[PDB]
Structure 1
Amino acid sequence: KTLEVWIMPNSPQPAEDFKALVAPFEKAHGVEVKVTVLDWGVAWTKITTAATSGVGPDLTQLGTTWVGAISAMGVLEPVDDVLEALGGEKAYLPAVWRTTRLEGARQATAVPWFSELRAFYYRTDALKAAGVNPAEMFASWQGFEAGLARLKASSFRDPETKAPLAPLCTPGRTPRTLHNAAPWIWGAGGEIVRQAGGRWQSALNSPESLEGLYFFLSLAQKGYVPAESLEKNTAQIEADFQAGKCAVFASGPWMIQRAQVPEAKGGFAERTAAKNLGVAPYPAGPKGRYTFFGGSNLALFNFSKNKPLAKELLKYLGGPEAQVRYAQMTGMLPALRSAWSDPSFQQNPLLRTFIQAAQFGRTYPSLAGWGGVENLAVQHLGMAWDLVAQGRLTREALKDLMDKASAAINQALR
């Protein structure tokens, strides 16, 4: 018996770490688990070819935001039984439980595996040298912009690069997702889509959504984000933070683990950034504190010839011991509420900042058409960033771009 699992690159040697995690299950049940690692950039294509063809693994990792679209294709085995075995709805944060199904589906189709949410990593040495108090900078939008202003003024140079640091690094290349933009939209009192009047419609062009987006993109326009950063993607900016080029950058909890791994092992432990690392939550906007809350679930294809063994592997991967172990190896958070108490999470002060930020986590609605919506939003946001690269983003230019995105999103939501 060989069980097939597809996963994404959740740790530095992702297949080895997954193989170590399931070894006790393999021994107990007399099976080999065969793992395939898919890069995030292609995983959606490969999982959808599997859905449409009926040729694929037993289990796949799914980003939480993908569960609705794959569920709607009718290729996922119901897993209400597995979720009840793991303690049901009470065992999960609502933000996680909502990811277990297509919104308005009668059955669960994904088992929570791990959670992650976004916060700001910052250079403790750089904010000190600029006289920025992080408790002020990360409190409000006003604090944030004043902190970046001090950081632009600062005479600080990285000890390794002997060069200045960008106040804020954020990618300007057309993004794959709204994860970076979402907290700004939400903090202004906006949303990406809104349910009202028996339907979902775009809200990207609401006055609140546009205030949040404009506030965010205009930081770069004011010189707090260098031109070089506008020409990079998320991975490039992450490498730039590691390499000592950025004072502030937003990411998830995994960067804490990577900071304890040597560079030659896929981390940045030797680097000045690893030795001077802080974490602060997203600042409150005018309408409050929000961050993107996501993670990954596991799903079982209903064409699997190994559903019994696969359901036992889902209960194993979703249960307390494996929850702690995998989160320890990846730097993610457990999906199961009870596993957060482990001292490897609670006694880690940077991760404690992420745990506290989870109070303000916000998810996307689990819609069948979510990917279509997010893809039209990011195409138009990429045009917005291209105007920032000219210094020509106006409120009117942004509104016109979000009015076009909204027309297209509304047409897709019909």
Structure 2
Amino acid sequence: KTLEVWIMPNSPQPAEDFKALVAPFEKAHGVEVKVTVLDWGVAWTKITTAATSGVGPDLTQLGTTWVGAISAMGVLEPVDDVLEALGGEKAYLPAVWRTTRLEGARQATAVPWFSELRAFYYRTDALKAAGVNPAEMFASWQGFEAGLARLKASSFRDPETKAPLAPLCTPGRTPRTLHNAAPWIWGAGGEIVRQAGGRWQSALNSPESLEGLYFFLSLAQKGYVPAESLEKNTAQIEADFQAGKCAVFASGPWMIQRAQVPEAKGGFAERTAAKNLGVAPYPAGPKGRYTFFGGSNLALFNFSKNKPLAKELLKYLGGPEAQVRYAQMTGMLPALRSAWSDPSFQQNPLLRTFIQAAQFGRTYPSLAGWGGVENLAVQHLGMAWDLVAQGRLTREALKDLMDKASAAINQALRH
């Protein structure tokens, strides 16, 4: 007997970790679980192709932000039974509970697998050499920019590269998602979409969203982010932080685990950045402190011929044993609230900072059109970043891009 599962690259050796995670299940049920790893860059397309075509695995990993869109296509098995067997609504953070379905849906269509939220990794050696107290830098927008100015003026040089560090690296090339931008939007008291009456509408062109976007994008126009870094994607900026080329950058808690794994095994433990590694929350904006909170769930296709066995595997993967183990393997946080209290997560000082930052975590709504909204947003924000790279992003040009972004988004949401 056989299950097929699709997962994204959650850990250094994604197939092998997942295989080791499900071995006791394989033993106890006399079944083989076959796993296929999809790059995040391709996963949306493969998962919607499976959904329209009726050809795919029994189970797929789904990003929390995708659950609504795939559910609304009507292709997922209800999983209220699994969620009840795992302790129902009470067993989850309300933000995690809301990702188990398309907003307004009767039935749950995804089981929470792991959670993830964003914070600033920083070079403790580079901040110390620049005279930056991280508690000041990461308290506020004003502290953040004062710190980047200090990092820019620093005479510090990385002991291996023998070169200066950029103060901040953020990608300006393939903005797949708004994850990087959202906290600046939210911090200014903006939103990506707003519900008024029944209807969702873009708020990317609200004065608040525009203040936050302009603040963020203009840091690179002020020289805190080098030219180089606006022609790079997320994976390259990650590599650049690891290679000792930036003082500060925004990512999720998986980097903590990668910092403890040798180069040889797909980590960066040998690098100066790994041995001089700090974590601070996003600074509080003028209307409050937010960070992107997400993660991945697991869903069962309703065209599967292995539904009961697939539900047994969902129970196992959402359950306390596997929740703690997979979080360890991947460096993500568990989706199951109880598993947060495992000492292995409380005792890592960097992870403790991610856990405290979860208080200000903020999710996207679980909308049916969410794929097209995010896709339309990043396409126009892309063009904003191209203005930055030529030193031509004005508040007015940004308003124009976001007005158009908003027309396009409102049009898709009317569908």
Are the counterparts in 2 of residues 174 and 385 from structure 1 also a CA contact under 8 Å?
no
Give, in angstroms, the shift of residue 26 of structure 1. 0.7
Unaligned runs of 5+ in 2: none
Which whole-Å deviations, capped at 9, do the CAs of 1:208-259 have from their partners, x for residues lacking one? 0000000000000000000000110000000000000000000000000000
Quick one: distance in 2 between partners of 1:229 and 1:267? 21
Q: Distance in 1 between matches of 2:27 and 2:150?
A: 57
Q: Would the aligned equivalents of 1:110 and 1:298 in 2 still touch at CA under 8 Å?
A: yes
How far is 1:174 from its partner? 3.5
Q: Counterparts of 1:302 and 1:245 in 2: how far apart (Å)?
A: 47
| 2:33 match | 33
> Which whole-Å deviations, capped at 9, do the CAs of 1:155-210 have from their partners, x for residues lacking one?
00000000000000000114000000000000000000000122100000000000
- The answer to whether residue 139 in structure 2 is matched with residue 139 in structure 1 is yes
State the Cα distance separating 1:344 from its structure 2 match: 1.2
Equivalent position of 2:19 in the other structure: 19
The aligned residue for residue 251 of structure 1 is 251
**Alpha-carbon deviations, 1:308-340, whole Å to 9, x = none?**
100000000000010000000000000001001
CA contact (8 A) 1:174 1:383 kept: no
Which residue does the alignment assign to 2:71? Answer: 71
Distance 1:44 1:220 in 2: 30
Partner of 1:346: 346
Deviation string 1:369-408 (CA, Å, 9 cap, x unpaired) is 0010011100110000000001110000000000010001
Deviations 1:110-151 (A, max 9, x none): 000000000000000000000000000000000000000000
Q: Give me the whole-angstrom Cα distance separating, in 1, the residues matched to 2:259 and 2:270.
A: 8
Instruction: Tell me the residue number matched to 1:225.
Output: 225
Distance in structure 2 (CA, Å) of the matches to 1:333 and 1:32: 27
Q: 1:257-336, aligned counterparts within 5 Å?
A: 257-336=257-336
Contact 2:254 2:332 in 1 (8 A): yes
**Structure 1 CA distance for aligned equivalents of residues 38 and 395 of structure 2:** 39
Structure 1: tracts of 5 or more residues without a match: none
CA contact (8 A) 1:101 1:108 kept: yes
Contact 2:8 2:37 in 1 (8 A): yes
CA RMSD of aligned residues (A): 0.5
Matched residue of 1:379: which SS?
helix
1:149–1:224: 8 Å Cα contact kept in structure 2?
Answer: yes
Q: Deviations over 1:5-32 (max 9, x none)?
A: 1111101110100010000111111101
CA separation in 1, counterparts of 2:89 and 2:350?
A: 28
Structure 2 Cα separation of the partners of residues 6 and 379 of structure 1: 27
SS in 2 for 1:357: helix
User: Identity over the aligned pairs, expressed in percent?
Assistant: 100
Deviation of 1:53 (Å):
1.1
Is the 1:205–1:399 Cα contact (8 Å) retained in structure 2?
Answer: yes
- What secondary structure does 1:219 align onto? helix
- Work out the CA distance in 2 between the residues paired with 1:234 and 1:75: 31
Give me the whole-angstrom Cα distance separating, in 2, the residues matched to 1:174 and 1:195: 28
Looking at structure 2, the residues matched to 194 and 124 of structure 1 have their Cα atoms a distance apart, in angstroms, of 39
Q: Distance in 2 between matches of 1:128 and 1:73?
A: 52
SS at structure 2 position matched to 1:83 = helix
Contact kept in structure 1, 2:5 and 2:34, CA below 8 Å:
yes
CA distance in 2, matches of 1:197, 1:298: 32
CA contact 2:261–2:268 (8 Å) conserved in 1:
yes
SS in 1 for 2:295: strand
Moved over 6 A (4+): none
Q: Is the 8 A contact 1:174 1:381 kept in 2?
A: no
Q: Write out per-residue CA displacement over residues 32-88 of structure 1, whole angstroms, 9 at most, x where no aligned residue.
A: 111111110001111111111111111000000010110011110000010011001
Shift of 1:343: 1.3
Q: CA deviation at 1:153?
A: 0.2
Q: Distance in 1 between matches of 2:406 and 2:55?
A: 36
Contact in 1 for aligned 2:160/2:272 (Cα 8 Å): yes
- How many residues align structurally? 414
When normalised by structure 1's length, the TM-score is 1.00
* CA–CA distance in structure 1, aligned partners of residues 16 and 351 of structure 2: 24
Match of 1:399 in 2: 399
When normalised by structure 2's length, the TM-score is: 0.99
Q: What is the SS of the residue equivalent to 1:132?
A: coil
Do the aligned residues in 2 keep the contact of 1:201 with 1:413 (CA within 8 Å)?
yes
The alignment partner of 1:250 has SS state of: strand
CA contact (8 A) 1:136 1:143 kept: yes
Distance across 1 between alignment mates of 2:299 and 2:59: 5
Aligned partners of 2:59 and 2:301 also within 8 Å:
yes
8 A contact 2:174–2:232 mirrored in 1: no
What is the CA–CA distance in structure 1 between the aligned matches of 2:15 and 2:47, rounded to whole Å?
18
Indicate whether 1:103 and 2:103 are aligned.
yes
